Ligand SMILES: *[C@@H]1O[C@H](CO)[C@@H](O[C@@H]2O[C@H](CO)[C@@H](O)[C@H](O)[C@H]2NC(C)=O)[C@H](O)[C@H]1NC(C)=O
Ligand SMILES: *[C@@H]1O[C@H](CO)[C@@H](O)[C@H](O)[C@H]1NC(C)=O
Ligand SMILES: *[C@@H]1O[C@H](CO)[C@@H](O)[C@H](O)[C@H]1NC(C)=O
Ligand SMILES: [Pb+2]
């Protein structure tokens with residue numbers, strides 16, 4: 001609906017402050033009216049449309065970089081399910097940084113929540129996703145600032161409809177740590 005904006009580059013802005021000149025103030029970001037629009041549908045895993053309450057969405061990813069998350073910013077992915085159970089301790093010890101490859105080909109460390117706009121209301125890419133642990137040689141990947149995801153093993157490029165990132169608990173030998181990991185669909 002929003003001119004020249006893929007649905008997966010949008011965020012729900014119904015809670016944003018609607019200004020006088022018609023533009024919006026979304027979490028400190030000025031969103032021009034042209035980048036906004038009403039939606040009465042939300043794409044689903046199968047790329048079909050479903051109905052939802054007439055709400056206003058904004059194409060914020062064209063204004064500030066976005067991170068394609070699987071769930072709300074403070075949830076953890078537990079074996080493919082969004083789980084809101086992070087203790088204050090985990091929230092403090094978790095690694096909030098993502099390595100994003102920029103257009104000049106360089107790598108930049110970015111805080112997932114403060115330096116990027118977390119998209120969490122998008123449909124789950126599929127049921128039973130597997131996750132990549134880039135500490136293993138076959139699990140390496142590249143995450144571009146523009147949203148493109150590249151899986152090294154089979155050199156396939158995934159768009160925002162096919163992957164999502166989320167905090168996840170990894171085993172540290174005989175300990176445990178939380179880091180953000182990408183989730184892909186095995187057969188989809
Ligand atoms: C997002 O960035 C990626 C990587 O910078 C773009 O995809 C690359 O496009 C070049 C163009 O010649 C290809 O040679 C590369 O092989 C592509 N890399 C991958 C991993 O696909 C992508 O086009 C950008 N998306 C947008 C909308 O600009
Ligand atoms: C709306 O007002 C803000 C400041 O209050 C201004 O920065 C912005 O450019 C205005 N919107 C447009 C479309 O000019
Ligand atoms: C980003 O790169 C650092 C340094 O190589 C690495 O230790 C860290 O695991 C990476 N971050 C994520 C979320 O994979
Ligand atoms: Pb826990």
Ligand SMILES: [Pb+2]
Nearest residue numbers: 131132133139
């Ligand atoms: Pb693996």
